[PDB]
Design a protein around this nucleic acid. Structure first.
Length: 769
DNA sequence: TACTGCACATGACGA
């Protein structure tokens, strides 16, 4: 019940002052909406990098208004590219924002400035470095040596509004893996080729930063490759030129035969750097580094200790010109009531509700297990129990001629035991997976031709695919295309598994003087666990057979999730208690963004189909965006629902609100709860409990969709949700984000970080055109 | 097959 944050008070904020000079933009009256605000942002990016100053945008009224700092002087005021031509007229009267006053809309301006000048003392600390601007600050000394790769520890620092008034600082520990020894001067033109688009840390003497390799230079470090005023200069002469004073040996005694890399500046010029001073960033999310990744998951006491360490060590004194700032040593703490999980409804009128008499921790663990065993118990079971429509199972020819039939037999029997009301009985079909190519084209040609033959009766298909490319950072093209084409050209709803995981669960045995396949539990997969999880996720949830739903209404009558990536948008809708769930894909113009009209279209169409089934009149609507919410998207959303209030489809006085769900937060905040100190836990720091929550503002909040009883390792990552519009109190939004995340349908006995709405986007949009 | 925690990704530097 007692919680501590990673938000820290800022003392001495007075005197510190921010002076902007609002402008306004003329450009093109052609406010193409998605194309107007895209250009607003491009200029503020272009201007911030070029003039190295905190330019902000303030979109009130006409959405114009660029804030220029008052210490820059020769301001061009006109700016090319950007298609059309642009002019910035001032809006006069010079601003002088303050950190003691009260909530403005100029507080996005104070926050920009505050973040800009706080990274000035840290940037000039000889023992810290920063890969790039906005990123965390790392110790130059590795925390751990870890054999051929070094583990660096860092702490991110972000200005925030303080809930008890004023301004503070949110912080979080970070980790980074860098190879111990440099690329080297002894690395040839061909090996430096193999390294383009990798990233490396450049130890440019005392100045450390990170860049992305774009090219191998034609010139060695000692040959003339650039020139300062006509005179052709070598890169080695250039670095000696800009070394200062007691320059370290490494940057004034380079091997002249070593190679150089090339890379682009923030403002897009070309620059070189000697390979002798460059250390490859070990992309531990590119290559599977299981032993390494364990080192980056911190226990709550480890995580609190490193964040506070860094605050006490580097932030107790801060000289921003005149001002002398301090970060308080004690982070903001508070008493709160934690949200209890919601009552849920299963089969046979059975309800599951958290016991209020047990202590919270025991109550949460019993409830979360009960979600699984109630689902499995034949006398309670799924909330939605009917017979399945016809089902197809589509297998590679090479699998059907081997372990296929043993797998299918086990899989059906697993479905029948999980979901006995369904009578699962699929028709087993094959496609000629060895006939055309084994790459994405070829597999597709074999799959299509089976569909064109009409061999897929039934509208639901579970298709088993070969994994074309692995590495948990590529993208499953083949699975995406089979869903688009099987749904567009034919009317099919398709789920997907892969051939490798279940293959590893079968071995060939000789029985009754005949070869047959049977299970094995060697290593490669827990095959029994694989069948249960795939039966649930691919067949039951694939057929919209929800195993449990909310007993009691949320604050929103309907709530809608929206994500867009790779020119594929996904809308999802959750109404009644999860009793109504619709997931609808749709192609888009932009890669990650939606046209004002495409929003009004898809949503009116989805909601109108379901409104006859929603027996309470609709009067509170919530949209959950995955990422930033662009105002072309908010407009289409305000539009859609204004209409339906006139047509009488919903209540006349109904209202909408839009919220961003920032699964990767720009201000990562953590929460801690406390315990009896205990030898192994000297300070007694533990995870917060599952329902803990915190409001920093009327527009920013945090909710622990994961937490104490149900986390097996690490420290909980609270979920950041930000209001973008509407009459809905952020506390109310936080409460049903939490209720929506107790619908743990993919793994009932678990916590689940995202609410169901944007959780539905992830699995659906894993398949993007 | 599925769950979390993790590093991967808007906006200042630096050959």
């Amino acid at each position: 019940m007692t919680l501590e944050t990673t938000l820290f008070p800022l003392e001495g904020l007075e005197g510190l002052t921010a002076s902007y000079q609002l402008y306004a933009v003329k450009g093109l009256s052609g406010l193409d909406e998605t194309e107007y605000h895209k250009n607003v942002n491009l200029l503020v990016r272009r201007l911030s990098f070029s003039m190295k100053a905190p330019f902000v945008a303030l979109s009130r009224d006409g959405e114009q208004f660029i804030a220029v700092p008052n210490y820059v002087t020769e301001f061009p005021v006109d700016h090319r590219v950007v298609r059309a031509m642009v002019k910035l007229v001032p809006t006069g009267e010079p601003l002088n924002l303050r950190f003691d006053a009260a909530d403005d809309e100029y507080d996005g301006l104070r926050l920009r400035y505050l973040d800009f000048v706080l990274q000035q003392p840290l940037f000039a600390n000889h023992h810290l470095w920063q890969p790039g601007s906005g990123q965390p600050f790392f110790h130059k000394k590795p925390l751990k040596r870890l054999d051929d790769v070094d583990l660096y520890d860092g702490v991110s620092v972000r200005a925030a509004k303080h809930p008890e008034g004023g301004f503070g600082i949110v912080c979080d520990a970070r980790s980074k893996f860098i190879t111990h020894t440099p690329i080297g001067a002894r690395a040839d033109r061909k090996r430096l080729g193999k390294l383009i688009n990798r990233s490396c840390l450049y130890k440019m003497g005392d100045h450390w930063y990170q860049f992305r390799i774009d090219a191998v230079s034609d010139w060695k470090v000692g040959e003339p490759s650039l020139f300062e005023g006509n005179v052709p200069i070598s890169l080695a002469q250039q670095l000696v030129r800009t070394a200062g004073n007691a320059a370290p040996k490494s940057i004034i005694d380079l091997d002249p035969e070593g190679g150089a890399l090339e890379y682009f500046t923030s403002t897009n010029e070309r620059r070189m750097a000697p390979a002798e001073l460059c250390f490859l960033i070990e992309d531990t999310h590119g290559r599977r580094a299981a032993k390494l990744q364990r080192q980056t998951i911190l226990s709550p006491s480890e995580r609190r200790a490193r964040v506070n360490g860094f605050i006490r060590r580097y932030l107790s004194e801060l000289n921003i010109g005149g001002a002398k700032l301090s970060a308080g040593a004690r982070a903001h703490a508070f008493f709160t009531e934690t949200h209890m999980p919601p009552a849920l409804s299963f089969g046979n009128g059975t309800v599951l509700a958290p016991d209020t008499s047990k202590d919270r921790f025991q109550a949460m663990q019993e409830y979360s297990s009960m979600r699984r065993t109630m689902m499995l118990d034949k006398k309670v079971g799924f909330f939605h129990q009917d017979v399945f429509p016809p089902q197809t199972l589509l297998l590679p020819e090479s699998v059907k001629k081997s372990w296929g039939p043993a797998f299918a037999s086990d899989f059906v029997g697993t479905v029948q035991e999980l979901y006995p009301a369904g009578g699962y009985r699929p028709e087993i079909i094959e496609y000629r997976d060895k006939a055309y190519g084994g790459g994405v084209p070829g597999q597709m040609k074999a799959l299509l031709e089976v569909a064109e033959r009409g061999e897929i009766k039934s509208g639901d298909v579970l298709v088993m695919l070969h994994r074309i490319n692995g590495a948990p950072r590529a993208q499953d093209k083949l699975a995406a295309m089979v869903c688009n084409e099987f749904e567009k050209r034919f009317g099919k709803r398709v789920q997907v598994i892969h051939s490798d995981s279940p293959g590893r669960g079968y071995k060939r045995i000789f029985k009754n003087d005949k070869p047959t396949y049977v299970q094995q539990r060697g290593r490669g997969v827990n095959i029994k666990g694989y069948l249960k999880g795939a039966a649930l996720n691919k067949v039951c949830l694939g057929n919209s057979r929800w195993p449990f739903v909310l007993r009691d209404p949320l604050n929103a009558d309907v709530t809608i999730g929206i994500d867009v990536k790779n020119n594929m948008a996904v809308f999802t809708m959750v109404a009644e208690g999860g009793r109504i769930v619709r997931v609808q894909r749709s192609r888009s113009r932009q890669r990650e963004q939606l046209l004002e009209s495409q929003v009004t279209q898809v949503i009116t169409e989805m909601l109108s189909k379901e409104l006859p089934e929603i027996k309470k009149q609709v009067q509170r609507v919530v949209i959950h965006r995955d990422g930033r919410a662009w105002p072309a998207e908010i407009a289409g959303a305000r539009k859609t629902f204004a209409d339906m209030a006139e047509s009488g489809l919903i209540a006349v006085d109904a209202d909408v609100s839009v919220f961003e769900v920032l699964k990767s937060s720009p201000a990562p905040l953590r929460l801690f709860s406390f315990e009896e100190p205990t030898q192994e836990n000297p300070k007694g720091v533990i995870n917060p409990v599952l329902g803990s929550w915190l409001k920093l503002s009327e527009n920013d909040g945090y909710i622990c969709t994961t937490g104490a009883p149900l986390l097996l390792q690490g420290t909980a990552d609270p979920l950041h949700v930000r209001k973008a519009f509407g009459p809905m109190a952020i506390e109310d939004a936080l409460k049903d984000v939490f209720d929506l995340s107790c619908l743990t349908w993919p793994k009932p006995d678990s916590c689940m970080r995202l609410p169901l709405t944007i959780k539905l986007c992830d699995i659906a949009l894993f398949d993007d055109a």
